[PDB]
Amino acid sequence: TSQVRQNYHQDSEAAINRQINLELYASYVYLSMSYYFDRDDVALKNFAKYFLHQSHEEREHAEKLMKLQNQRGGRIFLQDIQKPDCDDWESGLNAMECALHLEKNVNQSLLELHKLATDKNDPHLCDFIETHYLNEQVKAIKELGDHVTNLRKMGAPESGLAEYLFDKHTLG
Amino acid sequence: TSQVRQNYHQDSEAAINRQINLELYASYVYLSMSYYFDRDDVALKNFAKYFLHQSHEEREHAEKLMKLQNQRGGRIFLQDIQKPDCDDWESGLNAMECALHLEKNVNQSLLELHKLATDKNDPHLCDFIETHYLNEQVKAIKELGDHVTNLRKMGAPESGLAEYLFDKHTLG
Amino acid sequence: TSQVRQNYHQDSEAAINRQINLELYASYVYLSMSYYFDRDDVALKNFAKYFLHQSHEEREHAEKLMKLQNQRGGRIFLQDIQKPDCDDWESGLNAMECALHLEKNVNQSLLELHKLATDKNDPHLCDFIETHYLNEQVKAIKELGDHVTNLRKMGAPESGLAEYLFDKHTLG
Amino acid sequence: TSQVRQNYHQDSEAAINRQINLELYASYVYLSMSYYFDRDDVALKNFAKYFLHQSHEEREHAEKLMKLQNQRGGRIFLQDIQKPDCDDWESGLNAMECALHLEKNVNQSLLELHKLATDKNDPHLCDFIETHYLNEQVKAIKELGDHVTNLRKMGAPESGLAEYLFDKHTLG
Amino acid sequence: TSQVRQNYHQDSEAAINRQINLELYASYVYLSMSYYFDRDDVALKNFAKYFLHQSHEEREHAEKLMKLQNQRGGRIFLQDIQKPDCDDWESGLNAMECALHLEKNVNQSLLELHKLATDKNDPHLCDFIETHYLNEQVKAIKELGDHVTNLRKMGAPESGLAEYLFDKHTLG
Amino acid sequence: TSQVRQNYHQDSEAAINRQINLELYASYVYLSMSYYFDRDDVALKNFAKYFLHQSHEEREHAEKLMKLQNQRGGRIFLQDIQKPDCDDWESGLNAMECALHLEKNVNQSLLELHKLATDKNDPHLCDFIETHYLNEQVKAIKELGDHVTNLRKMGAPESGLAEYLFDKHTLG
């Protein structure tokens, strides 16, 4: 047992590890979408840049858990980062919906991590999920609900005139 | 009776109080309009910005009438601010049409206020409504018919391609 | 139902929708207080500036809850804004008292709102109350208790020499 | 009872005062260590400058609480500060080992203060500990574990060459 | 015996160790006074900001002595820090008075340290007390006599109008 | 058979995807080593900062190949990122020893990739390896050889005085 471990339950330690893997998987998925729009037969230069900057952030979310995992006294345990379910994301409106489905499945995991943190009476881990993740996940899910709504109203995905202009005026 | 009241009729004091309620109601409408556009299923951000800035300018109008009330010996009497007629504003072309319809019934309230101030031989109250409100109300009514007409010609509301671009290039 | 709604209980959506009302009713009272001290037979301009800024913050309080709703996927349902039951505020000591009695009632509402939030396992809505409202309320109450204790200790309300001196050195 | 006290349970009041005395004690301990390393037969410069800083920091934690008590409506009652359990701290490794044992005891105390804050339905006191203490303890406890780990790996306290080189290159 | 100790007598060594304890006891008193005026039922802001600084100073006085003790080749022995004689300081005139009697009792001690350093033919230990404490204490006792004289002539403690106006114009 | 594909043999496209995985497998190893030397019982920061930056570079090596696959009509096929064979890397000498064994194995992969690129008459791919990778790999291998040599020559891993001194002057 580490000399700095204090009020750090063993079930809370394994949950952080599985959260580390989930955010890494999210970093892979956003990278997968990023370079689908980089293709010549799609070529939405700003969807590639949006989904790339979001693949930079999830890689940054997982480094902050390993930081905390080392602070509280646990030991990080890495697993395989699975491959994304899709290699072709069809269109932009389809990708923006699977990301909203992705951050809704990550928010539920942060929302299952927190209830365990309260049951284990771990007040420091609570306010860590509280401050750095839940307040951002709500904004991001509100962000991807935004774009999907506009894309749908603009006549997506059947009218490519919508994808090009939205790419310039929203993600530009 | 206030020691500074001079050429200030009791019917004029009552009328300004009605105007203060109508200015306050006007802002409360713009508010309900703004955060309908902020919804994740309407998703227009510059329509939220436009109707929030206009919500700021209607309080500043109501505050400049209370500043005028204390100046001339009158006393402010506050009534409730009724809730707006609607919570859902349908679409962008509809909201711009209800605001033109709104600043047209406040312009009457000023034109019926100025008719009173002239029938009371009240030159200063006349000139204050003239300099800080009528010149602005016509400028605002001229603006909303401008926005209303372009949405009409673009194809609004049935072509969501319109509202998106109008939000970007006119209200941006 | 909204796409971006997740772990957002309908009781919590209703509870925020009443807290939006209360925060706006707080900006109304401070408004009336502000322009009471601008009255010529009151003639304390720093007391007016103090309540005029606090009436512009309780407005910034209500705007964020409206932002928070659309974030969580709720829906705003605005109701009427009750008038302040007072239109003459006696003096400066009685105005600071009613605001101290007011900000405690806003605190007591935010506490009951957080009690409900702790129930329906919504630890996001929890912190949002915690971070931006709870500690700021405790400061607002302490600051008011500082001004009420002062005014009493010097000669309020039976000595206007006190009210004048407090207006120029404290809120100046 | 105070004009500002609200939802403040009397057990929370006395517990804040006990936490006040512990934070002042941690300041009297870190000071006793500092001027032990200033001694001519010890003569480790940055060892004194780092414990002096940590005796300045724990002091500021105490005000924050004394500032909090007045904020909520309790009364600051204070008792004596006990002398440190040691007048001669052996070595730098033994000092960092006594300091690591100190912070975990303070963390322990805050962790039981949170358990009592939640037990009394006191949300504002809950996060005041969460925001300002529960994270800075873990950041401090993890750090002291690094100082103990690196000193030990260098051959302390048997090799004075270690405590020298570690004073210049880590705490310099 | 230390390799740097020279002409440092054992009586004067233990005397400084008491003088170290006596100046810490002063810091804990100004600390108690400061956050008594921060209370919501007193609320004299710069009374707290003044007494807080005087605590910040007497703490520095103690460190300089713990600096001297190591310089002269003594060994710092610490004792408990007594709690102040009160926890409610009634008024500013009564708090300023308990400071004038506190600061004179501190001079009395230094006055009996200088004779104790003169009798032992320790020409350094005398000039140290001479340069750094004997003059500044005289400066502090004369100022304290000015605040008491002004507060009494104003009408303290009976006229709260006094301690308010004194707070703003003297310590402000 | 994308409109931009030209002189891109099908085996060359497949071998790039194989390299994409290996480059991301390389990044995922240095991230494991990084947050090993941040553990409280290792406490070598510059070691954790060194492996983090090189993890971020093996990242950048991977996106460039994903860029290359799209600019020549190839298509990206992602596979799982394997977990590193180690979760605890013994010491600092061992981690740099495994990293030297890692880059030699990635270098060996690029050399075979260049040999295939020669067999298929693909003079563009033959240089993307030479310019942006082949000279990068030797500098990496040559640098890690300098670190392994120095660590061994001081007394690593049986001397902890070594790894600490190497962490502060080399990678610092």
Swiss-Prot record, chains A, B, C, D, E, F:
Its main location: cytoplasm. Keywords: Acetylation, Cytoplasm, Cytoplasmic vesicle, Iron, Iron storage, Lysosome, Metal-binding, Neurodegeneration, Oxidoreductase, Phosphoprotein. Fe cation 2 binds at residues 58, 103, 137. Stores iron in a soluble, non-toxic, readily available form. Important for iron homeostasis. Has ferroxidase activity. Iron is taken up in the ferrous form and deposited as ferric hydroxides after oxidation. Also plays a role in delivery of iron to cells. Mediates iron uptake in capsule cells of the developing kidney. Delivery to lysosomes is mediated by the cargo receptor NCOA4 for autophagic degradation and release of iron. One of its GO terms (biological process) is iron ion transport. Changing residue 103 to A: No effect on iron binding but the oxidation rate is severely reduced. It is an enzyme of class 1 (oxidoreductase). Its EC number is 1.16.3.1. It catalyses: 4 Fe(2+) + O2 + 4 H(+) = 4 Fe(3+) + 2 H2O. SUPFAM superfamilies: Ferritin-like. Expressed in the liver. It is linked to Hemochromatosis 5: A disorder of iron metabolism characterized by iron overload. Excess iron is deposited in a variety of organs leading to their failure, and resulting in serious illnesses including cirrhosis, hepatomas, diabetes, cardiomyopathy, arthritis, and hypogonadotropic hypogonadism. Severe effects of the disease usually do not appear until after decades of progressive iron loading. Neurodegeneration with brain iron accumulation 9: An autosomal dominant neurodegenerative disorder associated with iron accumulation, primarily in the basal ganglia. It is characterized by global developmental delay apparent from infancy, and progressive decline of motor and cognitive skills. Clinical features include delayed walking or inability to walk, spasticity with hyperreflexia, ataxia, dystonia, and poor or absent language. Disulfide bonds: none annotated. It holds the Pfam family Ferritin. The lineage of its organism: Eukaryota, Metazoa, Chordata, Craniata, Vertebrata. The gene is FTH1. This is Ferritin heavy chain. GO terms for molecular function: ferric iron binding; ferrous iron binding; ferroxidase activity; identical protein binding; iron ion binding; iron ion sequestering activity. Fe cation 1 binds at residues 23, 58, 61. Belongs to the ferritin family. Oligomer of 24 subunits. There are two types of subunits: L (light) chain and H (heavy) chain. The major chain can be light or heavy, depending on the species and tissue type. In the human liver, the heavy chain is predominant. The functional molecule forms a roughly spherical shell with a diameter of 12 nm and contains a central cavity into which the insoluble mineral iron core is deposited. Interacts with NCOA4; NCOA4 promotes targeting of the iron-binding ferritin complex to autolysosomes following starvation or iron depletion. It comes from Homo sapiens. Residues 6-155 form the Ferritin-like diiron domain. GO terms for cellular component: autolysosome; autophagosome; cytoplasm; cytosol; extracellular exosome; extracellular region; ferritin complex; ficolin-1-rich granule lumen. It comes from the Eukaryota. It is found in: Cytoplasm; Lysosome; Cytoplasmic vesicle, Autophagosome. Transmembrane segments: none annotated. The record marks 18 as: Essential for association with cargo receptor NCOA4.
